[PDB]
Amino acid sequence: MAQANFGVVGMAVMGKNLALNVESRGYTVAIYNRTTSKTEEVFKEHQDKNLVFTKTLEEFVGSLEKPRRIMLMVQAGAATDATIKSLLPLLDIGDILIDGGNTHFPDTMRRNAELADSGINFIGTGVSGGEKGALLGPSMMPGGQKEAYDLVAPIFEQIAAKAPQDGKPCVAYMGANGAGHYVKMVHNGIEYGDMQLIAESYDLLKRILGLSNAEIQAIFEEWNEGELDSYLIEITKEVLKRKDDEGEGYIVDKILDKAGNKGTGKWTSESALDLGVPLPLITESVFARYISTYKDERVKASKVLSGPALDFSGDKKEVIEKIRKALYFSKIMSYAQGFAQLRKASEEFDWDLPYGTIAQIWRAGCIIRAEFLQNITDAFDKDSELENLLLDDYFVDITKRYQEAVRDVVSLAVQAGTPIPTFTSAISYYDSYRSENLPANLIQAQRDYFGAHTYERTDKAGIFHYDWYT
């Protein structure tokens, strides 16, 4: 009783690895899982560690120090509500529940409010870095009551990854209620976008240039020594090494091209839509997953619909470099879009999000970890109030220099008939963002024509309606 410093509910791998992460920092950790068998499997395999085995929820709670720190690592949605409901009667006022699941932020906003009514603190935290990150050092995105966060921060700072630049822990207070799960949702949105960008690059190298997994692996390896340096490119060249475990060739080539999803990317796009925020790249990424889901229909369509025939007339080495430039340029478009979303959300939900710190805590631990996140944190260091990453001098320059290459890649791919939905949205966003005038004047004219919706003018203040008919 009161021997454990911290508790984890949910002994699937994420929750197990997190419990192990905490323990490895010199704490005693009570472990609990709904089906007792899984808790026993963890406990026996890790008997050497300072883990307290609990079989009932009261035994779990009873084993914890006041104020209790309990991390929930269960299935998002109804399973998380059920766990909270099960825990609530066993807790005392001042106790701290932490939801580390990939929860949709409005649920966190609702959970925070109702748990406050019972005098229980609720910290909705994003945990990024996969199963290995949860064990060795995640990026963490906590939101909720500051006072409660301050009580958990020491442990969070110990388990989190350190940025290689300055050794800063990749965790920080995001803000009130759902602020942390919101940032995490944007993280995953951006993740989808990067993976889709990398998929298109892979597809271009494979279909237009006819290159092999070994060749593409070497290209990604070389890319990762430069400004593109990121965890996602790293695991890409790694995935491309691996043999099929049940046949000839490579495992990547035997995986069915139907991308799964567990909601976060979709939620990011849904939020952008809600907020009035242009988020084309990450949204196209989500839709790219959905269209891969339509495999059966795609098989049928392949036999019916025609495309261009491919004979590549250019220089491989220099086209590879154009694609490299287009990848980096396009990532900049997507992060630019993503941070503008965080900005509008911060205003909408009154979170006063620390944009530069968000960048800082993504430098290590998280899936989107990359060297260029330092560049993003520098832009916000210069101007905390920066409206868009593209107006920072580092990114102005890159876009100035890489856009010619993007245009060439877009033309090549489109004429070859290779699908590049995110590369194309990348350049479209750039040309829209930089246009002083867009053809939305005509859209407003049509709207006023059929619907009397009114418009503003270019030459004077006020709201106007035109007599289109009389």
Place this chain on the structure above:
Amino acid sequence: MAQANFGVVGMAVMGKNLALNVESRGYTVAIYNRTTSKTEEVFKEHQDKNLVFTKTLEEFVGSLEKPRRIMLMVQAGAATDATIKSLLPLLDIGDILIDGGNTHFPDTMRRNAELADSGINFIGTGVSGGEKGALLGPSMMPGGQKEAYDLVAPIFEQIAAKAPQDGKPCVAYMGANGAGHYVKMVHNGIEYGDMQLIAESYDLLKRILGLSNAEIQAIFEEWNEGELDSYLIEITKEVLKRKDDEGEGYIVDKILDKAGNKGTGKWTSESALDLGVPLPLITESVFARYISTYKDERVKASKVLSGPALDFSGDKKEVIEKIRKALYFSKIMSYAQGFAQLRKASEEFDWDLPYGTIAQIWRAGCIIRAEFLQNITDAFDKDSELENLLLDDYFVDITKRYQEAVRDVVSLAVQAGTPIPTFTSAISYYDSYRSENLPANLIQAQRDYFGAHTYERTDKAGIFHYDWYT
């Protein structure tokens, strides 16, 4: 008392014009509005007509035949709930409330259920065609209880527009509860997409080819005599005629390029996201509106960010024709996407939507009215179970023949630096849909790598996880 055949609540223009539409078919119509002054303005201007002036809600209800038919034409959201709440105690079981507002369908699903608990019928109806359509002949998309719909159908069939092909009324039963507002939501989604497609075509003709409003008007006029024949192109060339009412030149050129929206397009995209349905074109259209909203930022970015310089080396007449082909091709992509959404929604909410009839009732009255809607109704006539419009022989052929032109337009626009977010998503969707294999295999590999998310194989049944680490 019981003299009026039908009632309209909401004397803004849509509701007034609808009340007038009904009256003009030989019915007596009771009119009501929250602020009495507006009802008086309508009544006096239309004293000749068979309108019953009501000043209180009881007077309005008391004036109607049992079972009462009351159409609500008020602001969507809370104003519609408030009107329902105000009406409910004055009604008798069997009465029929009809919500003709642009209501988000889940509100209709909720409203239908709770009103059924009180024995009141609820018909959520989409009304399309603008203020002029509401007066002269809308397209109508009713959902709710069939028995209640059958009682209102005679009047709906009279007020609705007739298809010029076969004189069929542009109204039909869509299905239960929210089915009608869902179809209407998709209608407006598709509308956004067409307007954005037309905006890009306009922008290309204006910026790349340096053409004038008179020139572009003549191009759209000629286009509208062919297969592109549609109401939206019609009002486009019409808008392009009109002089500035407060200065020199044309009104279109003095309208501020900030597209407004009232939710429906956003809801369409949000629904596609929910359903797992690829809807890139209509979604890019929504985002195109959002980015025009960012005018202040765009002004700043124009001064900082660089693009290519434009010198057009080609033949105007033939580039115009390529753009024409690209417009038609892209509309086909968007409707294809839109009908696939209706298909997944029908399954999700158990509506058994009549896809061919939906096409039929969009042939006239609605904003997206066009000759090619007959082609869509023919595709569903052939196969009611058709998975995607692109697998119909009429559209297979068009895409086969127009895709070369789209690729050329995309290349031209991208190299010129003119933003074409929907033209580019159009070709990306086509090349994705027709690909037997997509690079989503790599996405699944990365997901399994960092998150152990599992995959399916190309060569055998079952779910697999790979040992990426040991």
